[PDB]
């Protein structure tokens, strides 16, 4: 069986957030522009395989474009923490919305 944005989305996003939190917590950086990207992309692929409803594209694009101003510095000029936070919040909103819709078709 396969649903549009379900357990796969939750698992994928979960692994991602967990990895992000773990990596961010470890040492003092968001990631070495590899581990997070590798796992991220893998998860992104997992997310992509949940029916093309724009949201996935947006989520991927946001993360893709944001893939630079993540670490607490990354030679950025604006507030990396805030910028990332916003991107994360927006992404979360999309994920939760999709996951909710997928699991809860109608109400």
CB atoms near residue 71 (< 10 Å) = 20
Residue listed under structure tokens 């670490």: 71
Domain count, the chain: 1
- 75-96 in b/e form (b: 16+ CB < 10 A) is eeeeebeeebeebbeebeebbe
CB atoms near residue 59 (< 10 Å) = 23
Domain residues for 78?
A: 1-107
Contact 46, 54 (CB under 8 A): no
* Chain mean position to CA 24: 14
CATH number for position 102: 1.20.120.620
Q: Is 43 exposed, middle or buried (0-12, 13-18, 19+ CB in 10 A)?
A: buried
Q: Which helix (H) or strand (E) segment is 18 a member of?
A: helix 7-25
Cα separation, 25 vs 21, whole angstroms: 6
Closest Cα to residue 91, out of 45, 68, 57?
Answer: 57
Q: How was this structure determined?
A: NMR
């Amino acid at each position: 069986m396969v649903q549009i944005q379900g357990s796969v989305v939750a698992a994928a996003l979960s692994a991602v957030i967990t990895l992000i939190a773990m990596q961010w917590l470890m040492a003092f950086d968001a990631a070495n522009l590899v581990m997070l990207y590798l796992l991220g992309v893998v998860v992104v692929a997992l997310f992509y395989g949940r029916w093309p409803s724009v949201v996935a594209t947006v989520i991927n694009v946001v993360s893709f474009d944001l893939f630079f101003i993540a670490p607490r510095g990354t030679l950025a000029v604006s507030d990396v923490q805030y910028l990332l936070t916003f991107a994360v919040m927006l992404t979360v909103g999309l994920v939760i919305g999709n996951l909710t819709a997928g699991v809860r078709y109608q109400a």
